[PDB]
Enzyme design. Structure first.
Site, PDB file in Angstrom:
ATOM      1  N   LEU A   1       0.794  -1.232   0.000  1.00  0.00           N
ATOM      2  CA  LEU A   1       0.000   0.000   0.000  1.00  0.00           C
ATOM      3  C   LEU A   1       0.830   1.287   0.000  1.00  0.00           C
ATOM      4  O   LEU A   1       0.396   2.311  -0.532  1.00  0.00           O
ATOM      5  CB  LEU A   1      -0.936   0.004   1.216  1.00  0.00           C
ATOM      6  CG  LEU A   1      -1.776  -1.262   1.425  1.00  0.00           C
ATOM      7  CD1 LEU A   1      -2.456  -1.200   2.770  1.00  0.00           C
ATOM      8  CD2 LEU A   1      -2.794  -1.403   0.319  1.00  0.00           C
ATOM      9  N   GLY A   2       2.013   1.239   0.606  1.00  0.00           N
ATOM     10  CA  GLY A   2       2.864   2.415   0.657  1.00  0.00           C
ATOM     11  C   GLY A   2       4.213   2.121   1.274  1.00  0.00           C
ATOM     12  O   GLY A   2       4.378   1.107   1.944  1.00  0.00           O
ATOM     13  N   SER A   3       5.171   3.016   1.047  1.00  0.00           N
ATOM     14  CA  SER A   3       6.532   2.869   1.558  1.00  0.00           C
ATOM     15  C   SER A   3       7.080   4.130   2.175  1.00  0.00           C
ATOM     16  O   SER A   3       6.811   5.233   1.716  1.00  0.00           O
ATOM     17  CB  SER A   3       7.494   2.455   0.449  1.00  0.00           C
ATOM     18  OG  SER A   3       7.358   1.087   0.133  1.00  0.00           O
TER      19      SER A   3
ATOM     20  N   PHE B   1      11.632   4.088   6.767  1.00  0.00           N
ATOM     21  CA  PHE B   1      11.905   2.970   7.647  1.00  0.00           C
ATOM     22  C   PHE B   1      10.711   2.058   7.862  1.00  0.00           C
ATOM     23  O   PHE B   1      10.615   1.367   8.879  1.00  0.00           O
ATOM     24  CB  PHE B   1      12.424   3.494   8.986  1.00  0.00           C
ATOM     25  CG  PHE B   1      13.708   4.276   8.873  1.00  0.00           C
ATOM     26  CD1 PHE B   1      14.784   3.779   8.126  1.00  0.00           C
ATOM     27  CD2 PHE B   1      13.858   5.496   9.537  1.00  0.00           C
ATOM     28  CE1 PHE B   1      15.990   4.487   8.045  1.00  0.00           C
ATOM     29  CE2 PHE B   1      15.058   6.209   9.464  1.00  0.00           C
ATOM     30  CZ  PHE B   1      16.127   5.702   8.716  1.00  0.00           C
ATOM     31  N   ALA B   2       9.805   2.034   6.895  1.00  0.00           N
ATOM     32  CA  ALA B   2       8.628   1.194   7.030  1.00  0.00           C
ATOM     33  C   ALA B   2       7.940   0.928   5.708  1.00  0.00           C
ATOM     34  O   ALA B   2       8.041   1.716   4.775  1.00  0.00           O
ATOM     35  CB  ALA B   2       7.643   1.840   8.000  1.00  0.00           C
ATOM     36  N   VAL B   3       7.243  -0.199   5.645  1.00  0.00           N
ATOM     37  CA  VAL B   3       6.488  -0.579   4.469  1.00  0.00           C
ATOM     38  C   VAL B   3       5.159  -1.159   4.952  1.00  0.00           C
ATOM     39  O   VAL B   3       5.135  -1.982   5.872  1.00  0.00           O
ATOM     40  CB  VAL B   3       7.234  -1.633   3.623  1.00  0.00           C
ATOM     41  CG1 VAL B   3       7.649  -2.818   4.493  1.00  0.00           C
ATOM     42  CG2 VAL B   3       6.329  -2.103   2.472  1.00  0.00           C
ATOM     43  N   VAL B   4       4.058  -0.709   4.347  1.00  0.00           N
ATOM     44  CA  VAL B   4       2.730  -1.188   4.712  1.00  0.00           C
ATOM     45  C   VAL B   4       2.129  -2.022   3.588  1.00  0.00           C
ATOM     46  O   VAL B   4       1.889  -1.535   2.486  1.00  0.00           O
ATOM     47  CB  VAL B   4       1.756  -0.019   5.053  1.00  0.00           C
ATOM     48  CG1 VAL B   4       2.175   0.650   6.342  1.00  0.00           C
ATOM     49  CG2 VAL B   4       1.752   1.005   3.944  1.00  0.00           C
TER      50      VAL B   4
ATOM     51  N   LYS C   1       1.975  -2.966   8.872  1.00  0.00           N
ATOM     52  CA  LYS C   1       3.036  -1.957   8.793  1.00  0.00           C
ATOM     53  C   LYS C   1       4.336  -2.554   9.321  1.00  0.00           C
ATOM     54  O   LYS C   1       4.450  -2.841  10.514  1.00  0.00           O
ATOM     55  CB  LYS C   1       2.690  -0.716   9.611  1.00  0.00           C
ATOM     56  CG  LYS C   1       3.672   0.446   9.414  1.00  0.00           C
ATOM     57  CD  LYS C   1       3.327   1.614  10.328  1.00  0.00           C
ATOM     58  CE  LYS C   1       4.181   2.833  10.057  1.00  0.00           C
ATOM     59  NZ  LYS C   1       3.875   3.921  11.039  1.00  0.00           N
TER      60      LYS C   1
ATOM     61  N   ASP D   1       1.673  15.274  13.196  1.00  0.00           N
ATOM     62  CA  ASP D   1       1.984  14.978  11.804  1.00  0.00           C
ATOM     63  C   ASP D   1       0.705  14.933  10.980  1.00  0.00           C
ATOM     64  O   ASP D   1       0.504  14.055  10.139  1.00  0.00           O
ATOM     65  CB  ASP D   1       2.755  13.658  11.715  1.00  0.00           C
ATOM     66  CG  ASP D   1       3.385  13.430  10.342  1.00  0.00           C
ATOM     67  OD1 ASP D   1       3.803  14.419   9.696  1.00  0.00           O
ATOM     68  OD2 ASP D   1       3.476  12.250   9.922  1.00  0.00           O
TER      69      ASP D   1
ATOM     70  N   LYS E   1      -1.583  15.921   8.105  1.00  0.00           N
ATOM     71  CA  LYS E   1      -1.359  16.412   6.760  1.00  0.00           C
ATOM     72  C   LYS E   1      -2.231  15.557   5.866  1.00  0.00           C
ATOM     73  O   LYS E   1      -2.489  14.397   6.167  1.00  0.00           O
ATOM     74  CB  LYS E   1       0.117  16.264   6.365  1.00  0.00           C
ATOM     75  CG  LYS E   1       0.605  14.822   6.299  1.00  0.00           C
ATOM     76  CD  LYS E   1       2.075  14.776   5.970  1.00  0.00           C
ATOM     77  CE  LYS E   1       2.689  13.403   6.227  1.00  0.00           C
ATOM     78  NZ  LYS E   1       4.180  13.508   6.352  1.00  0.00           N
TER      79      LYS E   1
ATOM     80  N   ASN F   1      -2.215  11.869   5.574  1.00  0.00           N
ATOM     81  CA  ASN F   1      -2.586  11.094   6.753  1.00  0.00           C
ATOM     82  C   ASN F   1      -4.087  11.068   7.018  1.00  0.00           C
ATOM     83  O   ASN F   1      -4.543  10.530   8.032  1.00  0.00           O
ATOM     84  CB  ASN F   1      -1.827  11.576   7.993  1.00  0.00           C
ATOM     85  CG  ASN F   1      -0.451  10.952   8.100  1.00  0.00           C
ATOM     86  OD1 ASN F   1      -0.241   9.834   7.640  1.00  0.00           O
ATOM     87  ND2 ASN F   1       0.488  11.660   8.725  1.00  0.00           N
TER      88      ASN F   1
ATOM     89  N   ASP G   1      -1.130   7.112  10.969  1.00  0.00           N
ATOM     90  CA  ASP G   1       0.261   7.444  11.272  1.00  0.00           C
ATOM     91  C   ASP G   1       0.526   8.173  12.571  1.00  0.00           C
ATOM     92  O   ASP G   1       0.549   9.402  12.626  1.00  0.00           O
ATOM     93  CB  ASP G   1       0.884   8.222  10.116  1.00  0.00           C
ATOM     94  CG  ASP G   1       1.950   7.416   9.392  1.00  0.00           C
ATOM     95  OD1 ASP G   1       2.200   6.267   9.832  1.00  0.00           O
ATOM     96  OD2 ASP G   1       2.532   7.922   8.395  1.00  0.00           O
TER      97      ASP G   1
ATOM     98  N   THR H   1       7.081  16.868   7.294  1.00  0.00           N
ATOM     99  CA  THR H   1       6.856  17.818   6.222  1.00  0.00           C
ATOM    100  C   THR H   1       6.705  19.289   6.627  1.00  0.00           C
ATOM    101  O   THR H   1       5.715  19.685   7.233  1.00  0.00           O
ATOM    102  CB  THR H   1       5.651  17.370   5.457  1.00  0.00           C
ATOM    103  OG1 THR H   1       5.603  15.937   5.513  1.00  0.00           O
ATOM    104  CG2 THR H   1       5.741  17.823   4.016  1.00  0.00           C
TER     105      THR H   1
HETATM  106  C1  LIG Z   1      -5.840   1.358   1.045  1.00  0.00           C
HETATM  107  C2  LIG Z   1      -4.530   1.975   1.545  1.00  0.00           C
HETATM  108  C3  LIG Z   1      -3.676   2.590   0.632  1.00  0.00           C
HETATM  109  C4  LIG Z   1      -2.471   3.155   1.047  1.00  0.00           C
HETATM  110  C5  LIG Z   1      -2.139   3.096   2.394  1.00  0.00           C
HETATM  111  C6  LIG Z   1      -2.996   2.485   3.304  1.00  0.00           C
HETATM  112  C7  LIG Z   1      -4.200   1.915   2.896  1.00  0.00           C
HETATM  113  C8  LIG Z   1      -2.450   2.595   4.572  1.00  0.00           C
HETATM  114  C9  LIG Z   1      -2.922   2.206   5.825  1.00  0.00           C
HETATM  115  C10 LIG Z   1      -2.195   2.504   6.969  1.00  0.00           C
HETATM  116  C11 LIG Z   1      -0.981   3.180   6.864  1.00  0.00           C
HETATM  117  C12 LIG Z   1      -0.169   3.510   8.119  1.00  0.00           C
HETATM  118  C13 LIG Z   1      -0.500   3.563   5.613  1.00  0.00           C
HETATM  119  C14 LIG Z   1      -1.242   3.275   4.470  1.00  0.00           C
HETATM  120  N1  LIG Z   1      -1.135   3.526   3.164  1.00  0.00           N
HETATM  121  C15 LIG Z   1       0.026   4.229   2.596  1.00  0.00           C
HETATM  122  C16 LIG Z   1      -0.330   5.646   2.136  1.00  0.00           C
HETATM  123  C17 LIG Z   1      -0.731   6.559   3.295  1.00  0.00           C
HETATM  124  N2  LIG Z   1      -0.959   7.919   2.783  1.00  0.00           N
HETATM  125  C18 LIG Z   1      -2.942   2.030   8.042  1.00  0.00           C
HETATM  126  O1  LIG Z   1      -2.666   2.148   9.235  1.00  0.00           O
HETATM  127  N3  LIG Z   1      -4.035   1.475   7.516  1.00  0.00           N
HETATM  128  C19 LIG Z   1      -4.088   1.543   6.186  1.00  0.00           C
HETATM  129  O2  LIG Z   1      -4.974   1.088   5.464  1.00  0.00           O
END
Ligand SMILES: Cc1ccc2c(c1)c1c3c(c(C)cc1n2CCCN)C(=O)NC3=O
Length: 275
Positions: free
Chosen positions: A18-20, A23-26, A41, A138, A140, A143, A160, A179
């Protein structure tokens, strides 16, 4: 604190990313026992003081700590926490709706009233957080997520908590941020922080929510930090032509340099623009 030592892959089916972050990848995941979807996460542990990579245990411990204490409709809920030799895995609630601003970009311009519908949700969540003496630090657009985007009135969730802190009497706090474009002057001038900083960000977020333009974003990082510190911005008719006077007054009462003069979250909920 001791976290779940079993392999996260034994209880979950990890998948898509979902995102990077630095220091973390979700990654999206599915709990085997319930078949329910969650967000995984993966925070990289520092596991070596000298190393400037990874996050410190203290920082992780704090996010988990705050997360564990949170339980509100407009805030992401922590499901479980695992850890192994290199990572601390936080199984978080899944906001399949993605970013509110991505969803908004896919629709015709929201009326000022509809925009307020979303902003109020944000306020509710922050109202909960500040009521618990917790500052997000944080806030923004990125988030501000959506639980489900295929519903009548989609719900927004604040995510976050990596910068979140438990503001306690007795000791001031000097600095911690991200940011520049969204941080308050206190953060820029490394001055004592508190719940006021979140209110500043809220003003910045509403400003973008309404005009679609950032109030302090400059050409260079330095310029932004200077714009924010000098607290100089404007409601150029180009973007704020169809913006009510009440809307602008709200943003004004939040984009104030002196924290003690800035609108508190309680005040914002009572502001005439929010009614
Ligand atoms: C459907 C979707 C798409 C991107 C996601 C997430 C969910 C996401 C999630 C979370 C975090 C910390 C980052 C996340 N990201 C990364 C982008 C955050 N702006 C989270 O805690 N739940 C999410 O669904």
């Amino acid at each position: 604190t001791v976290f779940r030592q079993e392999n996260v892959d034994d209880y979950y089916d990890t998948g898509e990313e979902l995102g990077s972050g630095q220091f973390a990848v979700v990654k999206k995941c599915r709990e085997k026992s319930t078949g329910l979807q969650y967000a995984a996460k993966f925070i990289k542990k520092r596991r070596t003081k000298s190393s400037r990579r990874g996050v410190s245990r203290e920082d992780i411990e704090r996010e988990v700590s705050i997360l564990k204490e949170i339980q509100h409709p407009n805030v992401i809920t922590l499901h479980e926490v695992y850890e192994n030799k290199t990572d601390v895995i936080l199984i978080l609630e899944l906001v399949a709706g993605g970013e509110l601003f991505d969803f908004l970009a896919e629709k015709e311009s929201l009326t000022e009233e509809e925009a307020t519908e979303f902003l109020k949700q944000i306020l509710n969540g922050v109202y909960y957080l500040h009521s618990l003496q917790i500052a997000h630090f944080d806030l923004k657009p990125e988030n501000i997520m959506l639980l489900d985007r295929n519903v009548p009135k989609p719900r927004i969730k604040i995510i976050d908590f990596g910068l979140a802190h438990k503001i306690d009497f007795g000791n001031e706090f000097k600095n911690i941020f991200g940011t520049p474009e969204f941080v308050a002057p206190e953060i820029v001038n490394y001055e004592p922080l508190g719940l006021e900083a979140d209110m500043w960000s809220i003003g910045v977020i509403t400003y973008i929510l309404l005009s679609g333009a950032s109030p302090f974003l400059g050409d260079t990082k330095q310029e932004t930090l200077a714009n924010v510190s000098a607290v100089n911005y404007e409601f150029e008719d180009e973007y704020f032509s169809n913006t009510s006077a009440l809307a602008k007054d709200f943003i004004r009462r939040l984009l104030v340099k002196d924290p003690k003069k800035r609108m508190t979250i309680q005040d914002s909920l009572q502001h005439p623009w929010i009614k």
